[PDB]
Design a protein around this ligand. Structure first.
Ligand SMILES: CC(C)(C)OC(=O)Nc1cccc(CNC(=O)N2CCN(C(=O)c3ccco3)CC2)c1
Length: 121
């Protein structure tokens, strides 16, 4: 497919699968500062999957690379805030990251191929 716009619905569908994963539940809404009172000492740019879906639906991503950067920030924030590599929540983040990366690969390749075809002449 050389459809330059196809990534958006493909990302909406992938976010729907991520919301069905039990492994996403900690990452769906912004971290709780009442429960994790030191969170913002450690983490400068909070990110979560509801924020990513809302940014997509607002038309405030120009490319699937920008969406991929924000999703990867969810996972780097979990790794930076974890006290241990054997954390429940960090452990869930690593499975959900593997799932995300397996599915986003074709979305990125197809978009980049479509843009190259657009500038072929
Ligand atoms: C669903 C609803 C929002 C209504 O329920 C709530 O209000 N509570 C609620 C339930 C689940 C999840 C969250 C939000 N997430 C959350 O607390 N963290 C903690 C920090 N963190 C880490 O990556 C991490 C690494 C090591 C330890 O934590 C990101 C996930 C809130």
């Amino acid at each position: 497919s050389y459809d330059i716009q196809a990534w958006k619905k493909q990302c909406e569908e992938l976010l729907n699968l991520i919301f069905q994963c039990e492994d996403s539940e900690p990452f769906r809404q912004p971290v709780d500062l009442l429960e994790y009172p030191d969170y913002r000492d450690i983490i400068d740019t909070p990110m979560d999957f509801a924020t990513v879906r809302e940014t997509l639906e607002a038309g405030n991503y120009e490319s699937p690379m920008e969406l991929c950067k924000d999703v990867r920030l969810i996972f780097s924030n979990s790794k930076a805030y974890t006290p241990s590599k054997r954390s429940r929540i960090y452990s869930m983040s690593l499975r959900l990251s593997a799932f995300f990366e397996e599915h986003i690969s074709s979305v990125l390749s197809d978009y980049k191929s479509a843009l190259r075809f657009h500038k072929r002449n």
